[PDB]
A paper describes a structure:
Co-translational folding is a fundamental process for the efficient biosynthesis of nascent polypeptides that emerge through the ribosome exit tunnel. To understand how this process is modulated by the shape and surface of the narrow tunnel, we have rationally engineered three exit tunnel protein loops (uL22, uL23 and uL24) of the 70S ribosome by CRISPR/Cas9 gene editing, and studied the co-translational folding of an immunoglobulin-like filamin domain (FLN5). In E.coli’s 70S ribosomal particle, the tunnel’s unique geometry is shaped by the 23S ribosomal RNA (rRNA) and the ribosomal proteins uL4, uL22, uL23, uL24 and uL29. Of these proteins, uL4, uL22, uL23 and uL24 all have extended loops (ranging from 10 to 25 residues in length) that protrude into the tunnel, and along with uL29, have surface-exposed globular regions that crown the perimeter of the exit tunnel.
To further probe the shape of the ribosomal exit tunnel, single (23+L, 24+L) and double (23+L24+L) insertion mutants of uL23 and uL24 with loop extensions were also designed, with eight and nine residues inserted into the uL23 (23+L) and uL24 (24+L), respectively. These designs were drawn from two representative sequences of bacteria with exceptionally long loops (Candidatus marinimicrobia bacterium for uL23 and Actinobacteria bacterium for uL24). In particular, the inserted loop sequence of 23+L, which comprises of positively charged residues, enabled us to explore the role of the electrostatic interactions formed between the uL23 loop and nearby rRNA segments by cryo-EM. Unlike the uL23 loop in the WT ribosome that primarily interacts with 23S rRNA H6, the extended uL23 loop interacts also with neighbouring H7 helix: the guanidino groups of R73 and R77 in the extended uL23 loop form contacts with the phosphate group of A90 (H7) and the ribose of C455, respectively, while both uL23’s T81 side chain and the G83 backbone are in close proximity to A64 of H6. The extended loop structure and its interactions with H6/H7 were identical in the empty 23+L ribosome. On the 23+L ribosome, however, this interaction face is occluded by the extended uL23 loop, which is highly positively charged and interacts with both H6/H7 rRNA helices, thereby reducing NC-rRNA interactions and eliciting early folding.
Numbering used by the authors:
A (entry chain c): 2 to 272
B (entry chain t): 1 to 101
C (entry chain 6): 1 to 46
Write the structure that this text describes.
Amino acid sequence: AVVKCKPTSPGRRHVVKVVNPELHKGKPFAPLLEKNSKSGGRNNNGRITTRHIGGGHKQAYRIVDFKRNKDGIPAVVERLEYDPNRSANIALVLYKDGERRYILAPKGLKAGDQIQSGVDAAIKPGNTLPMRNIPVGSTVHNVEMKPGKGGQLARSAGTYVQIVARDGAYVTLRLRSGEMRKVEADCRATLGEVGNAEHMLRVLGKAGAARWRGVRPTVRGTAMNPVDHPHGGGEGRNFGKHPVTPWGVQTKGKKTRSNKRTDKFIVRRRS
Amino acid sequence: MIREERLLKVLRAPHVSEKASTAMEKSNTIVLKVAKDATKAEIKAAVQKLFEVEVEVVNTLVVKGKVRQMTVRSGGRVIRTSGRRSDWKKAYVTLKEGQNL
Amino acid sequence: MKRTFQPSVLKRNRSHGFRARMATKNGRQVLARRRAKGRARLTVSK
RNA sequence: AGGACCGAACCGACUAAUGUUGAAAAAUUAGCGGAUGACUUGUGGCUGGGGGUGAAAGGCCAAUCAAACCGGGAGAUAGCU
RNA sequence: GCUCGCCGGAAGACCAAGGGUUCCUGUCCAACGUUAAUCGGGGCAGGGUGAGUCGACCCCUAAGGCGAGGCCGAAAGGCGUAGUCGAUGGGAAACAGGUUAAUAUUCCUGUACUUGGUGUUACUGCGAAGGGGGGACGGAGAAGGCUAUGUUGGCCGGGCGACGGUUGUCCCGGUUUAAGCGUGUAGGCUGGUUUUCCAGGCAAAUCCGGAAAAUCAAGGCUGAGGCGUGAUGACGAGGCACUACGGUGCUGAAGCAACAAAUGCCCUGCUUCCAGGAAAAGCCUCUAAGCAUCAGGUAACAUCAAAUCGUACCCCAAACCGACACAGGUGGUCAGGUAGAGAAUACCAAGGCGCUUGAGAGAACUCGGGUGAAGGAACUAGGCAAAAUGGUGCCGUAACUUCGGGAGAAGGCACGCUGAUAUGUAGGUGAAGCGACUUGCUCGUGGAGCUGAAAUCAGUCGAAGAUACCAGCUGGCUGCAACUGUUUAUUAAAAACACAGCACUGUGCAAACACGAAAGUGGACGUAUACGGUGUGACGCCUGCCCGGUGCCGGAAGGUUAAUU
């Protein structure tokens, strides 16, 4: 649940933790780990391409089965556990031919639950089916956009999409942003919403809590010099200009999507 | 089977230097200068065949050459020149019970 | 206090050595210029 | 337990005096701040000049920075001295 | 040489980096050395660095680099796959004594250990660029068991005091001993052993994973320390032939126990937390192709090989970085005594130094200090500077508050030494003895011996008992910024920047956006509870009206309007 820390010092006064007592406290399952070295926001040219990234705690990448292609094999949830790479929790499951895998943990899942993939699977959370086999109106997560590619929508902590209509070879989903998307019905989705829904409620409390998540400080543009950012100088606090990015593009309203290749699939833009 | 010519090239000179005389008279080891590219097996074989002694073990070190400087009267002027002595290799050869020189 | 030259042989060779010069055409041009001048020590590789 | 407390190593640099052809091209002495952390440090590595990096000061990029250094255009031009 | 002084968590010792002979010896004093110089890190000559086990090389990989083909790009070239390099990390084994003027885990003495080759014998299923184990990993905290180490006693050797006393519960010194081999205990982890089966480990496995059944949990891994051996050896205070008395040389006693102990080891443990904590090889194991009374594997024994390069010296400094023999800078290791909480501080040990111009004098003035009558901020821009406070225990402590704070609030009192309680107490440790046992690295009991606070009563000295060093000034009202943090290396540390929080806005994933004439990369092996930009800046109560202007968003009937024809 969410717990408020007692104010025994500033920096503890405002921190709200979300503690999950059923998360497995122990080492992760080794055969599905690999190193995941940090980047600092730098690309192969060595330049900062994304600002405000660096430092943080060392973390290993857990190979999560986003495809769910083991069809007709029942699996039992061995244990839930923490993943540093995701806002959601993962579940280590045991396909009873003897193979372990990591899946995203839906809301109600717990150790001992049975999950299954395929077209003949039952309609209960954790089961993965093609979207043509899933009743219209149901909430799903970890949705494929291209058949056989793996889930890409609704993978965050408490997200899900709604199947609002089925039009022949395509389904219409209400994405979490409020956007109506059209996706072919042969893609797969997992029933239920993602688990760690109390994720938003955490309050970091102090600057260091963000620093050890890998986030470097953000200098306001208006605090810079005119050579550094279009929000230039002026003695005192002077703005007198339309807010823009560090590279001059007007922020605070201007649209930036430009993709004619895929915009035939967007039956409605988000609100 | 190191060939004869190799052996005839490796042993350059006996090194007389007090520490060498004491080594000879105390530990029964002779001290001698060897080709800088000589290996312990080469020195062993060369000493055994060319001095007709039986050797136990060889220790080797490389002496780095000092810098000496002096003058040269080339061109009538005595120009002060400096240069490095040549590095050489020193071998401590432990004979078993024989004696050669 | 602390000064700008903090020696290290490995970094010296990796930054200005012979093979570092020969790696790119620009370093090879440096070497050609130094040969043309008649430099006794071509690189830091001493 | 803690970007908790007092306080050495360690990391800083608030005040004063000295020094100012210095012991030193930024230090010394007496005090001063942090000292389990957004800490500090060793060895490697990466980012290159209208570029980098910047908890932002036009700061730092080899005692050099509102555009480094070296060579070249080059004997730039100088109604000025 | 004898005194004196200074350091002593260093100004001692050993290294890495860096330097490159500065190391040792003999000579010389021009120049160098801030003076003289017989001296020197100076000149000149000679000598000095010894490894199967230390390090490099080497096997393996991180960040990253290069990169066959490849994909891009006027050219140069960019990126990158297979691969190949790249330690600051992982892979194998030596200890103690002695010795040189200068080297030592390298030489010598004694005792070891590791890996590989080749043979002989015996018994045998062997075989991978493939599979699985393992290597293999965070922060903090808390014990407990130990050891390094120290103190005291015992023992051994020496002593009997330049001045009162000193044959005693007197004085000085020493009481050291390793790797290896054997044993396997304080602790830690884990149920084990068979049989059958299989949609997993790209194939296949007799290995790993999974499912059943039976039967015993009584097994196994790991593991400091102790003990034994190593060792009738070595070392050993000190004596004695010898002797340039430098010093060589020969003998050589005791060589035990208790107690207190680490920040070191058990411990890569255990508990706990969230921020969720390298890789690959060596190593163990399973088989595929393949081989077939071969080859290979395991064991014992024998034999051989372990190359090459470094090794001197300085290394918080006069050898490195600062033009200097420069008051600066420089990572790791070691960590003795008495007080002390302590690696602070004071005095010392081991060890090392007195800082390469000195000799007088005892003016002003300057620098660094000490003390001052009476006053006590009158000084000054300003209590700047100085003075002052300063410890432990107990008592006591306000407004305000986000209930944590404020708070060491403020303010008090008791501190030395001696004796009793108690010839040393509570506590800690714990021998002998007797008992057990699943029988010694055993348990229970027992209390010798050792160590040992704190308190109370009584007395006692001084002006003063946290006596030195060390070591908070305190309170009241306000501006600003919530706070810890960051910044103008070298005149600005702030109210500036950041910040957690808040809002707006973009972004549906080949995401927006950024670096790139491109390929590509970052964002992210993330996917709207996510990511980017912008403003504001904990928290509390709140955030009113204006869309005319400028931007942005949406719309398209009409006016105007490019190339083109």
